Amino acid sequence: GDTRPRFLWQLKFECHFFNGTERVRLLERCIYNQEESVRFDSDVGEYRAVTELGRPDAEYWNSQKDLLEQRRAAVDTYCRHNYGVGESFTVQRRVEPKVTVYPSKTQPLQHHNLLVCSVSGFYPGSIEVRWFRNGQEEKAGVVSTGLIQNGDWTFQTLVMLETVPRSGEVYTCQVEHPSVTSPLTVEWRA
Amino acid sequence: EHVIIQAEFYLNPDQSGEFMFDFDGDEIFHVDMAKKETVWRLEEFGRFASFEAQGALANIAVDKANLEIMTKRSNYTPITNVPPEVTVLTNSPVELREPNVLICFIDKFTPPVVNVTWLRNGKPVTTGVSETVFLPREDHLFRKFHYLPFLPSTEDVYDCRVEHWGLDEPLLKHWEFDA
């Protein structure tokens, strides 16, 4: 069948923004297969061979100072321009999380069980989840899936709590996120 | 910190090209090479911004030429097939008979060529399903999402069959509800 070698070429123009358009850094990187070969860093002002394979291109492009000028200016004409274009629906995007608490398994009480705090469909990805037992924060026995990207500009995450639930116990999951004025709390009574 | 990435790639001999913009790991839009038009990830995006898709093709042209120059300079050193990690999950906790979406998450792979089909009870599904193009990674591997809207039931099992040159055989990632 089709058994030919494959040859991949990638080009990435990376605009890095710190404190908005206050501090900007342009990274133009060329990757052959799995190997970055040549790179432009606006902090440096010129191309640098990341590997020997990309040295011809670095020398070749650096020899043209007018191209270097345009590249340095790109921080404004390109990076800062695009930031402003999409800022409204990207940097300012905020989607409130849906928070649900439920026992992992159906267990009679007084037996080990995981308390699952489901936090799904939120944006952006910055988030803080906290477990409480009867008003007291519990930092031990917390297993997390970490931040999960859905691919549709939403994130989800599961923060689980190792517990042996007693009748009368109150468990609270507190969620903090840029999309809410105050912490979201959800209770589960054993 | 925020990061906007203009990501392009070209693959030989497949002759596959891609042009997309990325924001903090999410796709803003990509250019459909065949139709020569901008496709926004979220359609709302197209109401606040525009892109001359035609320019993306000029770039891909240069990329293709550069690839062949590079291919030769490397004495025809081919890419190593790195098989993907595959994960199936729902975009929300499952409630029997309550609308949901299965997410086939394909990750950490290269080259950006893959074959994905959903199987319900051993049979392909096409109705309602959608996918994303290949998302770029900092290690220069790729990321990809496949979706399948569905009503959870105790009577159905699902599989996300993934084909990639890095695999010795098709990879099935099972998902089913358990009472």
């Binding site: 291109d57 695009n82 | 606040f48 770039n59 240069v62 550069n66």
Partner: peptide, 14 residues
Amino acid sequence: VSKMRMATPLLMQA
């Protein structure tokens, strides 16, 4: 405002 600008790839030699 208000269209996305793209950076252009430089061409190699030979």
